[PDB]
Amino acid sequence: AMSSPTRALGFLYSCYGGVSTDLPSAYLGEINSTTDEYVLPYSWNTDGYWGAYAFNTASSTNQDWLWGTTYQYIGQCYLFLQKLENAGSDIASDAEKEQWRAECQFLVAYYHFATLRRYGPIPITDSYIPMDTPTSEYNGRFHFDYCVDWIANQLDEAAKVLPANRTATNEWGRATSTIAKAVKARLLLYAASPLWNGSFPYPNWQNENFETPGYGKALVSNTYDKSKWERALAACQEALTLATTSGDRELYDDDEYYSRQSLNLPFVPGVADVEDNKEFLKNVMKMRYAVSTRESEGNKEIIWGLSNQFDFYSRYPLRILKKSDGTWHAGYSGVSPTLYTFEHFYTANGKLPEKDLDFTPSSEWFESAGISSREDIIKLNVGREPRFYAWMAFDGGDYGTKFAAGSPLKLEMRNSEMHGYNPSLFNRDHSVTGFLTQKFVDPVTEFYTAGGSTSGTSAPTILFRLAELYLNVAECHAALGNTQEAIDALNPVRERAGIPKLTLADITNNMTIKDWVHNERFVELWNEGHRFFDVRRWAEGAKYFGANKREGLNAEVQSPTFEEFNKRTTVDAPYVWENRMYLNPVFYNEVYKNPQMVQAPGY
Ligand SMILES: [K+]
Ligand SMILES: [K+]
Ligand code: NI
Ligand code: NI
Ligand code: NI
Question: Which residues surround ligand 2, an ion (CB under 5 A)?
Answer without folding.
Answer: 360, 379, 382-383
